[PDB]
């Protein structure tokens, strides 16, 4: 799981999760990762360097393999150039004349047979592409929502945990904007998933604590100075 945890996943939200489904050869499971090189990556399925998600893959020799030869799975072996990340190529052109024999057919078939041991068995791959960002969250975990309180409590807006107060804001958030960010790269305002109101995120009250005390060999009474904080706060 790139960028996410395999167990700490039911407590977060996502914008749009896409499950890429494809079956590759057993020994060919080496390039399913961000920034890999090879024939399969550069010809059939390439992952971007900024991929985020779990590359789920398991053995399926008992399902996608037949002793008589399961030739329903093909793979592109020849191509004019390298394949871009997240690109599909279904063309059956010959990579010359109209037919092959000299240029060859780039669509070869896998020899999926139960006789072949590990390495040549079919493996089903489910690429759960995750995109967690400032986009409005459309899918979340099974966690339930709590009552909304305003004016110093912990908040959880679409997985964004923190601590601060909530106040009625007068901003102009756009319908496609869900999270706000200030100069300090912190979240200053967030849109509630249930109600379309905008609430500012402000940290609770704090301040330096300066202790005014004489020498120990003189007395033990001390004074407290809450610098930067008024007495009414």
């Amino acid at each position, epitope marked *: 799981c790139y960028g996410v945890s395999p167990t700490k996943l039911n407590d977060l939200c996502f914008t749009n999760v896409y499950a890429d489904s494809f079956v590759i050869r057993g020994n060919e499971v080496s390039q399913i990762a961000p920034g890999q090189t090879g024939n399969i990556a550069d010809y059939n399925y390439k992952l971007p360097d900024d991929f985020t998600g779990c590359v789920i893959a398991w053995n399926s020799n008992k399902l996608d393999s037949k*002793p008589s030869g399961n030739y329903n799975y093909l793979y592109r072996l020849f191509r004019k150039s390298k394949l871009k990340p997240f690109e599909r190529d279904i063309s059956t052109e010959i990579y010359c004349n109209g037919v092959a024999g000299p240029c060859y057919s780039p669509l070869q078939s896998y020899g999926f047979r*139960p*006789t*072949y*041991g590990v390495g040549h068995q079919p493996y089903r791959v489910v690429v759960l592409s995750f995109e967690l960002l400032h986009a409005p969250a459309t899918v979340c975990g099974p966690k339930k929502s709590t009552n909304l309180v305003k004016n110093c409590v912990n908040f959880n807006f679409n997985g964004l945990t923190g601590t601060g107060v909530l106040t009625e804001s007068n901003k102009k958030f756009l319908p496609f904007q869900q999270f706000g960010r200030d100069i300090a790269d912190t979240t200053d305002a967030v849109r509630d998933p249930q109600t379309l109101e905008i609430l500012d995120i402000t940290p609770c009250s704090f301040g330096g604590v300066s202790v005014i005390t004489p020498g120990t060999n003189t007395s033990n009474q001390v004074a407290v100075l809450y610098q930067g904080v008024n007495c009414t706060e």
Partner: antibody, heavy 121, light 109 residues
């Protein structure tokens, strides 16, 4: 003692895709490699491939990669051959061999009775 | 590579014969991957000489082999009347066994 036996001799026409079998007993068949040897009348021996009864890790000869397949039934410890697109060049003797406790996995320890496949019309 | 063997040889009763066979390859782990097989006309082949450094069980001691570079030699002492059969050399260094052209052993008397 360990024993090995094959099926009876068969004579077919080019294009019938006959099937032969071989049964062994007296030992752990699933722990010994087994294969077949092709012998044409008047020439030397030829090796097609072998198979492991546990998992069918078939290793065919480079000259027999698309002419015949080798299979084995692990439930009954019986091998089964299948010739595709039978032609006039398949009128050769087929001897089977096993691994045995004599040599390595590729060394042929013992032999079978042999099965004659004569192409005729 | 292909193994080379003489098609027909001539011997005699009580004499010795040295079957020659070249073209044996080698791989990492050893070079003694040489074995011999005997097949009487109309009978199943039988393993007579394998791992020439040793001898199989049940095979008479009159059969022995040796190695010299890429050339192997099969020495058979005391050619009897029932020794008239074919012999083949086998090389299994590249995990692929190969057989020679066949040596028909004949004896005179």
């Amino acid at each position: 003692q360990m024993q090995l036996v094959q099926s009876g001799a068969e004579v077919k026409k080019p294009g019938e895709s006959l099937k032969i079998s071989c049964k062994g007993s007296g030992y752990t068949f699933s722990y010994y490699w087994i294969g077949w040897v092709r012998q044409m009348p008047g020439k030397g021996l030829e090796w097609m491939g072998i198979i492991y009864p546990g998992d069918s890790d078939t290793r065919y000869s480079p000259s027999f990669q698309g002419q015949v397949t080798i299979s084995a039934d692990k439930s009954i410890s019986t091998a089964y051959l299948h010739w595709s697109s039978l032609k006039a060049s398949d009128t050769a003797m087929y001897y089977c061999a096993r691994q045995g406790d004599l040599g390595d996995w590729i060394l042929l320890g013992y032999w079978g009775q042999g099965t004659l496949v004569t192409v005729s019309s | 590579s292909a193994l080379t063997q003489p098609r027909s040889v001539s011997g005699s009763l009580g004499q010795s014969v040295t079957i020659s066979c070249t073209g044996i390859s080698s791989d990492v782990g050893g070079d003694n991957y040489v074995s011999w097989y005997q097949q009487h006309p109309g009978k199943a082949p039988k393993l007579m000489i394998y791992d020439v450094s040793k001898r199989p069980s049940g095979v008479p001691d009159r059969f022995s082999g040796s190695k010299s570079g890429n050339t192997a030699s099969l020495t058979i002492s005391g050619l009897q009347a029932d020794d008239e059969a074919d012999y083949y050399c086998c090389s299994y260094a590249l995990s692929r066994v190969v057989f020679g052209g066949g040596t028909m052993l004949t004896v005179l008397g």
